[PDB]
């Protein structure tokens, strides 16, 4: 207390001065001259369920951004039988530049991503573009639009300069699911007469005027981009008599923005929670016909955490706790509150290393290329609740879930990290491998 302090009797009178800026008169920035065109790509290979197809993006414009994969499907059953089927159909999509994999997304990632990062009417509109949401009936035909979510598919700021890649081609490889719920299969039962999908891939191209087009064509460029890292693993399945726990190695690299994960029943796409005889939680739920072994497919997702299987979790780095152990509901509700601002469905979890993981601008990362032992430690809920008795579910406790929750045996762990896509002398690839 022998330090110097200031009385500040009129510190603020002293610190004032003239205005710097006025709110009521905007200056708009003059931008470059460009145009946007939607161009169809040629897809090689037969499109159909279970098939692998691909497309090369044609050099029609200078830069590319948005990519939408169109699919045409017909319902194989009535309303309540499908769940985001166009999302399910695109089993995966791989982005290759110069022959090097830059990224790769999975149907489950699209479901996880959406569940975690989209929101409000955007999420609804998304659902409109991937599912039947107006109680459509068997045979109903719709064109679905599945937007891709690669770094260049989200912002013009990361438009991929095909013009700057004169020696390297850019391709998308797409795996179509062998089965799509409510379209060609009802659970495990094939739907006789189901149609094969029609597919079309659209790329929205940016046409640049001469000065900017030339700079892209001739100069080296470094684009800060986001990559998905992913692998599936067995879940330490919980049971009626026990709280299972599991030490999961996190085989990730690069400065990671966040980790995200879900547990699921691989039988039913998007099922991240247990089934129960409560409205929407199972096929026929709330009635005598309810079966807690089959979801109400049209209502597969839920916010009822009582049906989720994670009791608590922590992430360790180099074997040491990165943060204090928190409950599954923390990862499901709070992380998203703080970091995204949307609402995340039960069974979907997030842990961010970033202030704002939902944005493009770096805001703190965890560099797993500098971490020797990254481990996710999970504790599961006890599967003791009789799912066929609503009272058992709705009146339960924090540490328990449905007996049907033991069917959520698959675990998917995803991570998003920042790498650099470098382009020069007509060629390109990633700045870092690992």
């Amino acid at each position: 207390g022998l330090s110097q302090l200031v009385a500040y009797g009129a510190q603020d009178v002293y610190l004032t001065g003239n205005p710097q800026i006025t709110f009521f008169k905007t200056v708009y920035r003059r931008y470059t001259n460009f145009a946007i065109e939607s161009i169809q790509q040629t897809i090689n290979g037969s499109v159909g369920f279970g098939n692998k197809v691909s497309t090369q993006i044609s050099r029609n414009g200078d830069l590319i951004t948005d990519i939408v994969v169109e699919f045409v499907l017909t319902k194989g059953g009535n309303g309540g039988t499908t769940y985001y089927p166009a999302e399910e159909l695109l089993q995966d999509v791989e982005l290759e530049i110069g022959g090097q994999r830059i990224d790769k997304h999975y149907n489950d990632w699209f479901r996880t991503y959406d569940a975690l990062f989209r929101m409000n009417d955007d999420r609804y509109n998304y659902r409109r573009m991937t599912d039947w949401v107006n109680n459509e009936l068997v045979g109903a035909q719709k064109r679905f639009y599945v937007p891709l979510i690669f770094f260049f598919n989200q912002t013009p700021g990361l438009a991929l300069p095909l013009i700057a890649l004169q020696y390297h081609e850019v391709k998308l490889y797409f795996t179509l699911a062998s089965q799509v719920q409510g379209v060609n299969y009802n659970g495990s039962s094939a739907i006789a007469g189901a149609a094969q999908p029609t597919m079309s891939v659209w790329v929205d191209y940016i046409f640049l005027d001469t000065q900017e087009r030339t700079r892209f064509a001739q100069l080296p460029h470094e684009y800060l981009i986001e990559q998905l890292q992913f692998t599936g693993s067995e879940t330490a399945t919980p049971s009626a008599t026990t709280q299972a726990s599991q030490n999961i190695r996190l085989n990730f690299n690069h400065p990671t923005k966040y980790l995200a994960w879900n547990f699921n029943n691989p039988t039913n796409y998007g099922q991240y929670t247990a089934l129960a005889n409560i409205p929407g939680a199972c096929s026929g739920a709330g009635t005598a016909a309810a079966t807690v072994t089959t979801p109400d497919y049209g209502n597969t997702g839920t916010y009822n955490e009582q049906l989720a299987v994670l009791d608590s979790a922590k992430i360790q780095l180099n074997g040491q706790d990165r943060f204090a152990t928190r409950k599954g509901s923390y990862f499901n509700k709070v992380q998203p509150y703080q970091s995204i601002g949307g609402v995340t469905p039960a069974g979907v979890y997030l842990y961010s290393f970033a202030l704002k993981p939902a944005g493009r601008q770096p805001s703190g990362t965890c560099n797993f290329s500098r971490i020797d032992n990254a481990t996710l430690s999970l504790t599961y809920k006890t599967c003791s609740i009789d799912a066929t008795s609503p009272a058992a579910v709705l009146g339960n406790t924090e540490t328990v879930t449905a007996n049907t929750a033991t069917l959520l045996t698959a675990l998917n762990i995803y991570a998003k990290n920042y790498n650099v896509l470098r382009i020069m002398s007509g060629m390109g690839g990633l700045a870092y491998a690992n």
Partner: protein, 153 residues
């Protein structure tokens, strides 16, 4: 070991008020050039004078060591105006005339509250002129956002 520090007074810069410079309103017109305005309530008995340390022109001595804080910001003196030893109309005569006070409180007479750089003119010579002890700044009651009248310390 890291060497300890003393008062370390905080001084701002004088500002352009239109055709003249003067110290900002929460501050006083202290010294010159290197130390033009005091911000903190105490400052470095600036040596430059006439030469003489009082304290100087606008601050008065306090009973302390560390020259950096021996003068207190916001004072002046009786400053004879016309025929009477009155403080400026915007100044507050403490009442410490001189004779009834010790040296330190005798000097600290006018309490220049809210009027550290500018004051108003006085009806002293029958003409509403700049107080006898200050510089005649070109502003008037009609001029907006400049409530100060001919004055500077």
């Amino acid at each position: 070991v890291v060497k300890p520090q003393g008062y370390k007074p905080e001084f701002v810069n004088r500002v352009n008020f239109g055709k003249f410079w003067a110290c900002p309103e929460g501050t006083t017109d202290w010294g010159s050039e290197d130390k033009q305005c005091l911000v903190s309530q105490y400052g470095p008995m600036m040596w430059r004078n006439k030469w003489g340390w009082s304290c100087p022109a606008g601050s008065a001595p306090n009973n302390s060591d560390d020259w950096n804080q021996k003068c207190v910001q916001g004072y002046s003196m009786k400053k004879l105006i016309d025929g009477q030893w009155r403080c400026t109309d915007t100044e507050i005569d403490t009442g410490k005339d001189w004779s009834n006070s010790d040296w330190f409180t005798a000097q600290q007479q006018c309490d220049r509250g809210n009027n550290k750089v500018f004051t108003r003119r006085m009806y002293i010579d029958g003409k509403w002129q700049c107080p006898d002890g200050t510089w005649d700044t070109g502003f008037t009651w009609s001029d907006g956002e400049n409530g100060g009248k001919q004055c500077k310390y």
